[PDB]
Amino acid sequence: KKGDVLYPKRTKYSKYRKGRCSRGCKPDGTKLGFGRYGIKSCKAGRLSYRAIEAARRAIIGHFHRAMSGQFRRNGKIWVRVFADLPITGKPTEVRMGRGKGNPTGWIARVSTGQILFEMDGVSLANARQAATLAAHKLCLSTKFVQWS
Amino acid sequence: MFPLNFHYEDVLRQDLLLKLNYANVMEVPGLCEIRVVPKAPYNFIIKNGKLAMEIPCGQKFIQTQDLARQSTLRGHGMSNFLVRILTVMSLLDFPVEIRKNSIQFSMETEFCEFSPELEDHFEIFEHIRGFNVTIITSANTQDETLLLWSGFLQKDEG
């Protein structure tokens, strides 16, 4: 959580292996767990916590301006993707091997069919347009999913 | 032969059969054990604390690892201890508390002040906070325990 920017308070180990993320699907299909509408991914890749926070801020700021008054917080947002892999990096003007570099940020591994966001308590058109606004901040291809 | 358990078997068992709903004569509550444990702030070192426990219980205590002292009384020793405490109970109005299956009593120095056999050697029991006495009964219900204690607490006054 940590307010806006989401990463763990502490980890078991400081540095992790790179791993692979270009494959992986949900082998059983996907369904919404909390909300009526949602945004899911169609491809697999990496998303940074800054991008996830920017997408969440875009959705909540669209609801803020579309619906005011007592319905201003009637919209509920669930963020179902969490960034818990630190990435590292060596600065400029450094040679190749003297260990491993300092950590610079956090990423999340996203699979094909993973639900990134879930929305409830709003109109269908507001949910579709908030998904449209939020997908412009993510590098992956996303789809709007509806409960049925 | 002995007054307490004889009174239980001859009077209270029949009336406790008749007063409550029981499927068998082995479902009647009885009397298991008495557990005596001294009150919390005490010395662990002086011989008064050991002797003031050995004298009213009649058997050696256990001192576990020195932070805990305990005595458990079963059988005829438990009956003698109970018929002493119930006789000295008739000289005052000491409070007791009924739990789900057991009776709690507070063995203060004002109890051994009124015990006629402990009027002498009173300097043993002086400077002692007291004990906590537990009477465990084989009772399913707190009301069974209350009925059993009201049966056992008898006097000729009133």
Binding site: V94, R98, G99, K100 | -
Partner: protein, 98 residues
């Protein structure tokens, strides 16, 4: 820049040396292990570092307990079981006499 991590240890070569159905002669080491991953069964002895070895010439059979998941290794002897010498001295003498 300096790392503090360059240490490892020499390999120990553990594992199962004789699998199921293998033919063993006495003295053969079956499983070398850290702790009793396999417990000794019939005609299988154990050393001070939980090494399992064979005592009779036969074939290695494994066993698993279904409830607890414990595992045992037995050796089926080649000629079958051998009775005690007190029985071979007394009861077999009377068996030949009867």
């Amino acid at each position: 820049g300096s790392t503090k991590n360059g240490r490892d240890s020499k390999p120990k070569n553990l594992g199962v040396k004789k699998f199921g159905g293998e033919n063993v002669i006495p003295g053969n080491i079956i499983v070398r292990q850290r702790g009793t991953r396999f417990h000794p069964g019939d005609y299988v002895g154990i050393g001070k570092d939980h090494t399992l070895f064979a005592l009779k010439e036969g074939r290695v059979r494994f066993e698993k307990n279904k409830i607890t998941g414990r595992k045992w290794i037995h050796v089926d002897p080649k000629g079958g079981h051998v009775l005690h010498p007190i029985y071979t001295r007394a009861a077999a003498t009377k068996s030949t006499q009867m």
